[PDB]
Write a protein that binds this ligand. Structure first.
Ligand SMILES: Nc1ncnc2c1ncn2[C@@H]1O[C@H](CSCC[C@H](N)C(=O)O)[C@@H](O)[C@H]1O
Ligand SMILES: Nc1ncnc2c1ncn2[C@@H]1O[C@H](CSCC[C@H](N)C(=O)O)[C@@H](O)[C@H]1O
Ligand SMILES: Nc1ncnc2c1ncn2[C@@H]1O[C@H](CSCC[C@H](N)C(=O)O)[C@@H](O)[C@H]1O
Ligand SMILES: Nc1ncnc2c1ncn2[C@@H]1O[C@H](CSCC[C@H](N)C(=O)O)[C@@H](O)[C@H]1O
Lengths: 186, 186, 186, 186
């Protein structure tokens, strides 16, 4: 993995997603060199950069032009990005312009989760995987329900991570806010 | 329990200890109206205030004179403090001046945990309880090994707490750093 | 707090609720000697026993006759139960037969959470507290929306508890399933 | 990742290590096709199988003849194993017979952690990575002190994982015991 500290960040754009979470997203996604992936709400680019180096084509979407700008910087810096199509704009409309996908990671929904998912279902190639990253309690509930209603077998794993911070004398355990991963299939 | 946001802070002083943790500290301590308690490293006063309203006499110790002033402000602010003896100074010398104790909560050791624990065993009335609050990995190990070496039946419980926060479009789970409670048999 | 291992379990009855959770429930409930409390879904009696020794009258409700029997057994074993009115039956019908309450703990809803909460609100005395114990993701969401819709100031805390256990001459950390407490402003 | 439920368990051999933990071990290990790895205490084979399909040669060690049998069995069922050298015996003895390593995962130490680590240092190729999986509190402390003492830049990450399970028409969260990963520098 590309460590979190190698991500240039713009304080107005969240991310990158916790390395341990991005690691699990990749395990769940099972990126293949012939896969076409979409990262809805690319933010700082934490998920996009990892997908960039493992799949054929990645479509990174974001409402915020700054997120688009920051994701491109991190890509440029890590020598990735020539197989990444950046798309500024609201997800539903952006999603309609791309081809079918093998992998769909929803890093942000902005109130349009349900709409985003329905669309993703219609574009998901057979054997495709959907992974929704949820920090809001509502999102965890809505992602679960949405995917079930669309006919998927849904699973949810919540991660509570703590890392050692050498805080002058000992190692203090500093926790990261919990993040849940709602993912489809069996 | 006095909510955490009703504690007057001071930048140099850590605390108050997470309400959920203070709650468990009290459950493990089993405060009695005829108990004499000592709060080693009172900090902001989170543990001292709770003990104040439940036991006969509380001895609150701290190296930081600002921890002493902040604990006083909080004691006065909540109408408590007439059964609290504040003691500024390093714990080992401060501990030697107090009578025997029924309850001992170690909220901070500053490198002298082992010494602090030994003195505490010497002043512990029968049936007394010792509870060490540990945020450093090293402290969790030492508190366990030390209390066992002093002949106590030891236990440890770690709490990972997450609370909700109305975040910009919903409810975000904001985790608190993990805190372990190393305690001796009652 | 009455230790978890001092509770007799029945195969068809869940519980007792984790001591650390019961501890927090009590901190949030702030039991007073003149309080009238209701424990919806008493199960094994974990919450009922604690309330029994702190309030004036407790109304313990449960669908399962085996739960009513176990809660009754555990009270007797602990010399409690004279201020406890056991009520077998579905929560809504039973809730309508009791007087107004100062404290309401919902330990189980069985699909009728919303109904149970509406009824509790209609019977809550001024300054009363409601605490819902949620292990199901749906319940955490449902309790939050419902309490707000009923005009309450809602809060949620999710505890992840780990307890040390002897293993290989060392100490292994054993986790308990996470439990969330959804409670209203006091 | 090879799903957890796709490993055959022997009742006397622990494992496989939680998929989410094995996922992170791989992220931290950064397996390369020309890497030589050693899995100290292979148990059920959770770490060995993952390394098998990513590196050049893997040396899987275990005291338990049954652990060696379970690992070979799981290797065979997944069509792996031709690049895995199984070694029954105590780790230090076994570690001395293998060539230098790029990756070292310590899945079990059995009281000889310090010795095992000192030896791993003596055979670690430049740019090599060491990752110790710790479930015992003592091991977390020990791994840190030892690795610091051997001159490494040490880090610790503690994972608390919860997975949803269908219960009473809802989804309850089921936690796994916490596991810490103590790993070395660049
Ligand atoms: N409906 C929508 N359409 C497009 N982008 C959206 C959106 N709702 C939210 N977003 C974007 O969702 C992103 C979530 S932050 C994502 C961080 C990223 N996973 C990382 O690892 O760096 C934000 O940049 C936000 O603007
Ligand atoms: N050896 C020692 N003697 C006295 N005070 C000490 C000490 N080691 C640490 N401390 C004190 O330990 C405290 C830890 S912060 C404690 C916060 C408190 N439990 C609350 O709930 O508000 C600090 O104020 C620090 O100065
Ligand atoms: N609508 C309802 N009416 C009555 N009891 C209900 C109910 N829905 C669920 N329950 C009961 O809710 C209980 C939840 S288990 C509660 C365990 C208890 N808190 C303890 O500490 O021991 C079960 O015994 C179940 O039958
Ligand atoms: N000194 C030692 N030498 C060799 N094996 C050892 C050892 N100390 C402990 N072990 C082994 O350590 C293993 C730990 S269990 C490992 C499970 C494995 N990580 C999985 O994912 O399946 C056991 O099989 C045990 O016998």
């Amino acid at each position: 993995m590309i460590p979190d500290d190698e991500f240039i960040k713009n304080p107005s754009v969240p991310g990158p997603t916790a390395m341990e979470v991005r690691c699990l997203i990749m395990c769940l996604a099972e990126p293949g060199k012939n896969d076409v992936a979409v990262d809805v709400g690319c933010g700082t680019g934490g998920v996009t950069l990892e997908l960039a180096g493992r799949v054929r084509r990645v479509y990174a979407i974001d409402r915020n032009p700054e997120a688009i700008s920051t994701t491109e910087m991190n890509l440029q810096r890590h020598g990735l990005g020539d197989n990444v199509t950046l798309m500024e704009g609201d997800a539903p409309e952006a999603l309609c312009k791309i081809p079918d996908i093998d992998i769909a990671v929803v890093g942000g929904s902005g109130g349009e989760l349900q709409e985003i998912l329905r669309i993703i279902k219609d574009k998901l190639k057979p054997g495709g995987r959907i992974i929704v990253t949820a920090i809001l309690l509502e999102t965890k509930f809505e992602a679960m329900e949405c995917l079930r209603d669309l006919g998927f077998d849904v699973n949810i794993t919540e991660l509570n991570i703590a890392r050692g911070r050498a805080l002058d004398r000992g190692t203090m355990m500093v926790s990261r806010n919990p993040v849940a991963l709602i993912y489809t299939g069996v």
